[PDB]
Design a protein around this ligand. Sequence first.
Ligand SMILES: CCOc1cccnc1Cc1ccc([C@H](F)C(=O)N[C@H](c2ccc(C)cc2)[C@@H](C)C(=O)O)cc1
Length: 293
Amino acid sequence: APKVGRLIYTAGGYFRQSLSYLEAYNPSDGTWLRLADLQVPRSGLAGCVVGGLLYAVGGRNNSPDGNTDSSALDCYNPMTNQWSPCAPMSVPRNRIGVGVIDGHIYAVGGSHGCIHHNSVERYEPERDEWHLVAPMLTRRIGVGVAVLNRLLYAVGGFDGTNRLNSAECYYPERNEWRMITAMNTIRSGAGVCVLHNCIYAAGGYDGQDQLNSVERYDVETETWTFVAPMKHRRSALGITVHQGRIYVLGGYDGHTFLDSVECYDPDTDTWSEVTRMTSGRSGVGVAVTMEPC
Ligand SMILES: CCOc1cccnc1Cc1ccc([C@H](F)C(=O)N[C@H](c2ccc(C)cc2)[C@@H](C)C(=O)O)cc1
């Protein structure tokens, strides 16, 4: 499962306006590479990888001259250092969550102006097509998404009125969503990922405060348990897993757009500062793939 040469890629984000950056961090040597800018600035997007290709999904371009929610899907090839447009989603989705099952990208929730989506759609890379699947039971913007054992999980978010502690799971062979146990904490904008047999939710926003707490859902026991908290409170953070550890990148804490990156070791239940992004930002997309040629 592990292989040499993988980097943590961070795309887009927000600081004063939506950003076009693509930068890649190498845990083996501590370096950052600046790669080709996104074609369109975007914050509130999600990243993922299929077949060694990085995808940037959804978001919004908050710019000097407008706020435009994005239906775009764009693909970055590390081999060529080029972005290529793909077929767009059916609807713009800012503050989206994404997950990959069996080579297919699921785009979950998000907002379009005052519309809070519960809809969900699935992208087929070889065919370059999106199709709608069953909608979630709850409208969720700022939703955390992760995949474990070929099941898709949508965690927390904001329904337009309340921030959510609820979570739900999509069962592909039934094209059906079912609620799971609710989190201990209301979290909009949490970082959500999978590590071992658990879905982690780190940070986020409860409507009053950005959070440093972290909890994990054991898919067998159906319980949420707190683990050690991050050193820095943060919402709208990027997250990924690499070599058995969770990395959280940036975010917002009410005072600062963070450049902090923290790394969680589950065997010691400890967080450790690892590196700082080149500039503070929130609302990034993150994923891991092989280093650029
Ligand atoms: C000071 C202006 O800051 C801006 C302006 C424009 C864009 N981004 C920011 C930064 C920011 C401000 C507030 C926050 C809040 F903690 C926070 O998580 N919110 C949620 C949220 C979830 C996911 C994402 C990606 C963004 C925001 C939303 C759904 C909510 O629950 O309401 C988080 C980040």
